[PDB]
Amino acid sequence: LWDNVECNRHMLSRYINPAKLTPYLRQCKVIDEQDEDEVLNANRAGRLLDILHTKGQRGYVVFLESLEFYYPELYKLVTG
Amino acid sequence: LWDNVECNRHMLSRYINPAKLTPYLRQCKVIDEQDEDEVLNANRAGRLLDILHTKGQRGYVVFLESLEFYYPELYKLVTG
């Protein structure tokens, strides 16, 4: 069920601003400060998803919560 | 319907040499040499796909052929 986000790899990267998300992910200890700069200052969105696919269910749950909040319409697009 | 390619996007990237596909692709007349060395003279293959997206359905069709040809196992997963 990570294959939700993965189908939508293309368009998300196209619409989402990663910078808005990563804070809440930093907070929820899904990612650390190294991954936030690594995303932000290593298109950079694809990087974020890349690293999130490494994080299992805990990752997905949180990302989706952030995706819902800042990107509600896109999120519907992803979720069924 | 880019979906078969674009759901397997993460795993297609990790297992393709764009160098094997480009000359085929150019010659098919779907991409041009600017495209070829834009991609090549560089998920350095994410770009290849992204570019093909830009061509729509002919892009899709012809990308699928090159898998039928050069990564026949990848072709398999992609077509089911």
Numbering used by the authors:
A (entry chain B), B (entry chain A): 22 to 63, 71 to 108
Excerpt from the paper describing this PDB structure:
The CARMA1 signalosome, which is composed of CARMA1 (caspase recruitment domain (CARD)-containing MAGUK protein 1), BCL10 (B-cell lymphoma 10) and MALT1 (mucosa-associated lymphoid tissue lymphoma translocation protein 1), is a macromolecular complex responsible for lymphocyte activation. CARMA1 forms intracellular multi-molecular complexes with BCL10 and MALT1 that are known as CARMA1 signalosomes during lymphocytes activation and proliferation, creating a primary signaling complex for the activation of NF-κB. CARMA1 contains an N-terminal CARD (CAspase Recruitment Domain) domain followed by a coiled-coil domain and a C-terminal MAGUK domain. For assembly of the CARMA1 signalosome, CARMA1 interacts directly with BCL10 via a CARD:CARD interaction and BCL10 interacts with MALT1 via an interaction between the C-terminal Ser/Thr-rich region of BCL10 and the first Ig domain of MALT1.
In this study, we report the dimeric structure of CARMA1 CARD at a resolution of 3.2 Å. Although CARMA1 CARD has a canonical six helical-bundles structural fold similar to other CARD domains, our structure shows the first homo-dimeric structure of CARD formed by a disulfide bond and reveals a possible biologically important homo-dimeric interface and novel homo-dimerization mechanism. The high resolution structure of CARMA1 CARD showed that it forms the canonical six-helical bundle fold comprising six helices, H1 to H6, which is characteristic of the DD superfamily. There was one dimer in the asymmetric unit, referred to as chain A and chain B. A flexible loop formed by residue 64 to residue 70 was missing from our model. The electron density of that region was too weak to trace, indicating that the loop is extraordinarily flexible relative to those of other CARD domains. Interestingly, H1 of CARMA 1 CARD was bent in the middle. An electrostatic interaction between H31 from one molecule and E27 from another molecule was the only non-covalent bond detected at the interface. Interestingly, an unexpected disulfide-bond formed by C28 from each molecule was detected. CARMA1 CARD exists as dimerand further oligomer mixture in solution and was all changed to the monomeric form by the addition of DTT and by mutating C28 to Alanine, indicating that CARMA1 CARD forms a stable dimer in solution and that the dimerization is mediated by a disulfide bond.
